[PDB]
Design a protein around this nucleic acid. Structure first.
Length: 324
DNA sequence: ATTACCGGGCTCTGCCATCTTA
DNA sequence: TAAGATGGCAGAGCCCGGTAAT
């Protein structure tokens, strides 16, 4: 009865909430008052609280003890109340979609038992909070899968391959083993690729390739291949290009294409680009903005060393002064 | 004095489908 | 037998500067 009214004064988007979890609006008891007071107690703003509830209404069904207990468990990982408030604003659901504080505590123990430092748990929690709402068994599967994958290739100690990969790729525990498997086979298939090279790639520059959704890597690579082929790059040149800079796989087709075109329209050859792949780091705005500045001064661009297009503001802007 | 090489910083959902559970 | 709990999916970069090399 009082529910709909309280939510209103709280500032909640009631229509959106209703549509997200209608089941919660058919409960005869709810704790929206306790929740609001609880989150206020911990620093949250009035609008954040409304936003949280609007996106994950079931939040209002937790008790002060559950909330406080779960919070205190998050405080075993993150050092301050404010850090947790920010994570909850950014995704409420990782905190509130489970009321199983025992599982949570077991997750924490299991992760520690994998040999992860607190700083690494903190990095997980802050950037992939949903790791902590996974069931223990779910996090176990991924770790097991990774060990198995580690030794299925040539890794001298899998236990340490796991830590390297989890530190470099903090999102790995919230991907399915299906997705990750498929991205590893994509890499092994498309490139060479001996286990030793595949390890390095996977632990290092290619680490987040493992988090790409189904077929998105294959599709993105296909586009890179087409686009470079069309410009007179051989397949070997294309592979070498992508392995030297796997981040290029993350770009959307159009973004990669527009980036290439915007450079070559200034007479930068494809060869200049693929031999200095880091120029593709800059956004299109930054590239266009810098190109204008440089042509707008003496510069050729066809013969210039284009590495500067991806330098820091400070280093770029200094070289530009000198150039005039 | 200037560029290259290379790794690190920041990275934090919101939905639906399919079970459990009471 | 309806909610709650859980798994799983699409989504689609940019920037900085330490330190080696020249």
């Amino acid at each position: 009865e009082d529910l709909l009214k309280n939510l209103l004064t709280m500032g909640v988007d009631i229509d959106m909430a209703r549509k997200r979890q209608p089941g919660v609006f058919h409960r005869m008891i709810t704790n929206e008052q306790d929740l609001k007071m609880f989150l206020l107690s911990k620093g949250a703003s009035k609008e954040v609280i409304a936003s949280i509830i609007s996106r994950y209404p079931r939040a209002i069904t937790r008790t002060p003890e559950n909330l406080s207990k779960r919070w205190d468990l998050w405080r075993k990982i993150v050092t301050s109340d404010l850090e947790i408030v920010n994570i909850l604003e950014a995704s409420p659901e990782s905190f509130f979609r489970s009321n199983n504080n025992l599982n949570l505590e077991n997750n924490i123990k299991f992760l520690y038992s994998v040999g992860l430092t607190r700083k690494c748990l903190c990095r997980l929690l802050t950037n992939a909070p949903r790791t902590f709402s996974n069931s223990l068994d779910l996090n176990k599967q991924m770790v097991e899968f990774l060990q198995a994958a580690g030794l299925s290739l040539g890794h001298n100690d899998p236990a340490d391959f796991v830590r390297k990969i989890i530190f470099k790729n903090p999102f790995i525990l919230i991907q399915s083993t299906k997705r990750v498997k498929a991205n590893i086979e994509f890499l092994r298939s498309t490139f060479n690729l001996n286990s030793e090279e595949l390890l390095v790639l996977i632990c290092g520059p290619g680490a987040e390739i493992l988090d790409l959704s189904n077929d998105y890597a294959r599709r993105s690579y296909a586009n890179i291949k087409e686009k470079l082929f069309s410009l007179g790059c051989t397949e070997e040149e294309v592979q070498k290009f992508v392995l030297s800079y796997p981040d290029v796989i993350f770009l959307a087709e159009k973004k990669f294409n527009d980036k290439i075109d915007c450079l070559m329209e200034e007479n930068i050859s494809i060869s200049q680009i693929i031999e200095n792949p880091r120029v593709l780091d800059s956004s299109i705005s930054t590239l266009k903005s810098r190109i204008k500045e440089l042509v707008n001064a003496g510069c050729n661009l066809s013969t210039l060393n284009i590495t500067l297009l991806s330098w820091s503001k400070k280093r770029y802007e200094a070289k530009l002064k000198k150039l005039s």
